[PDB]
Amino acid sequence: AVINHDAVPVWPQPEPADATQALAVRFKPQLDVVNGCQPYPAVDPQGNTSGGLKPSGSQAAACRDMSKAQVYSRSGTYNGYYDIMYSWYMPKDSPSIGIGHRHDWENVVVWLDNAASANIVALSASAHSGYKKSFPADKSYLDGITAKISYKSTWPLDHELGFTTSAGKQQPLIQWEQMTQAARDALESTDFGNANVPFKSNFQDKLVKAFF
Ligand SMILES: [Cl-]
Structure with missing residues (x-):
């Protein structure tokens, strides 16, 4: 089911069960939210998903709560490189008050030799x-x-990620490899409207686009 955005629990960061999971914890990025929402949890272990926010308020209205911090990752290989994609979900994406989109999914890929x-x-x-x-x-x-x-909207555009010299914050990480099947199914099948989960069945397609 779709549940209220501020009702999705944070998935605690587990102890890594293996090297793969430990490596993704190691490389957890920092995120500097310059404007817009804090990252929120998008899914619970039962496969409920965030209903997000209608973009009717100011850029960060009702999506300010740093206790709801969550980051996701999925790891793989591509063209001989080892990749860890880190992804954040934001409840909405507003370039100005009262406008923009419900939901935001953003991601960086860290490429390792x-x-x-x-x-x-x-x-x-x-x-x-x-x-x-x-x-x-x-x-x-x-x-x-x-x-x-960095996570930031620069008018006239919606929020996007960028690289920054500025220190950012970290979030509890839950990895695709550590999720429940219910959560994976839900992330595969849920319509996030303007936004798209980048680490579902589209994962290799994304890595192709991301490839340097
Ligand atoms: Cl809507």
């Missing part, structure tokens, strides 16, 4: 239909191995 070496080769950040790419990864966008990402 391989999982064992884990050297960052490149970063991609979702911006509308495409990806901004940092290749070779610009070290000014890295706090050690932590990618520093």
Whole structure:
């Protein structure tokens, strides 16, 4: 079922069960929300999904609550690289008060040479239909191995991700690989309207677009 956006519980970050999951925890990015919503949980373990927000208020109205912080990831390989996609869901996406869209799904892909070496080769950040790419990864966008990402709307455009020198915040991570089947099914099948889950059955298609 669709449930109220502020009624989806945060999925606590689990102890990683394996190297794959530990590696995605390691590389959790920082997010600097310059404007718009904080990231919120989009799904619960039962497969309920966030109904999001009608964009009728100011940019951050009713989506200000930092206790609801959540980030998602999904890991894979692509063209010999090891990729971890990190994704945030925001309840709405407003370039100005009272306008914009219900729901927002954004994602960065951290590209590593391989999982064992884990050297960052490149970063991609979702911006509308495409990806901004940092290749070779610009070290000014890295706090050690932590990618520093901005979330921001610049008029006339909706919210998008970018790379930033600015410190950001981190969120409890739940990985696709750690979710319940119910949550995975729901994320696959739910219509998020203007927004799209980037780590569902479209995951390889996204990585292709993200590829540097
Ligand atoms: Cl609507």
